[PDB]
């Protein structure tokens, strides 16, 4: 069968703008390449997602079923690893003065937070705890080990003036997890209060991050790898740390092309059709309207090789009010009569689908 290449133009569809003579960036852009694919392809409007959730959907995973939770998402967003069965929380470095949280953010201080995060990444019996630091006070904690439950409360008391809460089970499956968590947050206090980083902050009158407030426990549910789920060997040409993470969660190989450099991404994706069956490419179009038009034109330019590989590949271009244009091109296909790729032209295409349909239509063409 043929290789598949899915290209997601992040941001895309826009609303008609006066500065482009009542046209969206997309309509205004010179895009012969995207237009070529429409002309020689099937076209339509994709409606994403019924009543984060999007790229997963395109990859064949129903979010209502496979979404890991806010917790695990923070972890991913911080270039962390998660596995199914992991417990993950949103976290804050905060200030605990005499058993009261006097600042849920440790004053937004950031300096030394990675070393803090490092110091409290440890093991305790069958459990391991991993923390990485984000912007300002932000962190994520991922816990691994046996029989973890997200039927537990927050440690965060959600306002200043209260002590950190003891984690309570919210239903009977949470009991053991709550014990393991309180034991771990006790250890974290002590390490943090005694850390070199916090002693210098106190000495310099900066707020110490002597406590880790934990919030939004989510257990990563069972997620089939990309191969298991789709019977394909897949890859991601992506830059977003959360997207890199998602792809790692799914055991797709990940490629971070240094760079604009739309070219290299399309060029790398093309080269991967030799090794893999499926390549997701994510492109950021992210400023005013002439500019947005201009980046779309830059993106079209980058897209030239795609005209030549339909003999051995299926190409898909889509974006991510609400609905978005979509094109499928492969060398055998019967154009449905639309000739332009835009929010209006593509609305005359044969396809009226959701992101959930994409993988099916991609497996069908391809053979």
From Swiss-Prot:
CDD domains: iPGM_like. Catalyzes the interconversion of 2-phosphoglycerate and 3-phosphoglycerate. NCBIfam families: apgM (TIGR00306), PRK04024.1 (NF003104). Keywords: Glycolysis, Isomerase. The keyword Membrane does not apply. It is an enzyme of class 5 (isomerase). One of its GO terms (biological process) is glycolytic process. Residues 155-176 have a biased composition (Basic and acidic residues). It comes from Thermoplasma acidophilum (strain ATCC 25905 / DSM 1728 / JCM 9062 / NBRC 15155 / AMRC-C165). Its EC number is 5.4.2.12. It catalyses: (2R)-2-phosphoglycerate = (2R)-3-phosphoglycerate. Pfam families: Metalloenzyme, PhosphMutase. Pathway: Carbohydrate degradation; glycolysis; pyruvate from D-glyceraldehyde 3-phosphate: step 3/5. This is 2,3-bisphosphoglycerate-independent phosphoglycerate mutase. Belongs to the BPG-independent phosphoglycerate mutase family. A-PGAM subfamily. One of its GO terms (molecular function) is metal ion binding. Residues 148-176 are annotated as: Disordered.
């Amino acid at each position: 069968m043929k290789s598949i290449i899915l290209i997601v133009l992040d941001g895309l569809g826009d609303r008609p703008g006066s500065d482009l003579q009542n046209r969206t960036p997309l309509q205004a852009a010179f895009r012969p390449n995207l237009n070529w694919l429409a002309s020689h392809g099937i076209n339509g409007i994709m409606h994403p997602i019924s009543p984060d959730t999007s790229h997963m959907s395109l990859l064949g995973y129903d979010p209502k079923v496979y979404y890991p939770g806010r917790g695990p998402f923070e972890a991913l967003g911080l270039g962390m690893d998660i596995r199914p069965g992991d417990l993950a929380f949103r976290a804050n470095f905060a200030t605990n003065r005499d058993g009261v949280i006097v600042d849920r953010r440790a004053g937004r201080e950031n300096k030394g937070n990675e070393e803090l995060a490092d110091a409290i990444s440890l093991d305790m019996g069958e459990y391991s705890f991993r923390v990485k630091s984000g912007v300002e006070h932000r962190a994520a904690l991922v816990v691994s080990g046996p029989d973890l439950s997200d039927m537990i409360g927050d440690s965060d008391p959600h306002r200043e003036g209260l002590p950190p809460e003891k984690i309570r089970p919210t239903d009977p499956s949470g009991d053991r997890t709550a014990e393991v968590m309180n034991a771990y947050l006790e250890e974290a206090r002590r390490i943090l209060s005694d850390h070199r980083v916090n002693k210098e902050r106190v000495k310099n009158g900066r707020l110490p991050g002597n406590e880790l407030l934990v919030r939004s426990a989510g257990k990563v549910p069972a997620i089939p790898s990309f191969t298991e789920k789709n019977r394909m060997k897949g890859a991601c040409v992506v830059g977003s740390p959360w997207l890199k993470g998602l792809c790692r969660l799914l055991r797709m190989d990940v490629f971070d092309v240094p760079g604009s450099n739309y070219r290299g991404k399309i060029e790398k994706a093309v080269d991967l059709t030799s090794s893999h069956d499926f390549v997701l490419v994510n492109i950021k179009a992210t400023g005013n309207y002439p500019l947005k038009r201009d980046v779309i034109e830059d993106i079209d330019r980058a897209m030239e090789p795609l005209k030549s590989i339909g003999d051995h590949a299926v190409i898909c271009v889509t974006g991510d009010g609400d609905p978005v244009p979509i094109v499928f091109y492969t060398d055998g296909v019967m154009n449905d009569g639309v000739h332009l790729f835009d929010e209006l032209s593509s609305a005359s295409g044969s396809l009226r689908i959701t992101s959930y349909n994409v993988m099916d239509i991609l497996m069908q063409l391809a053979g």
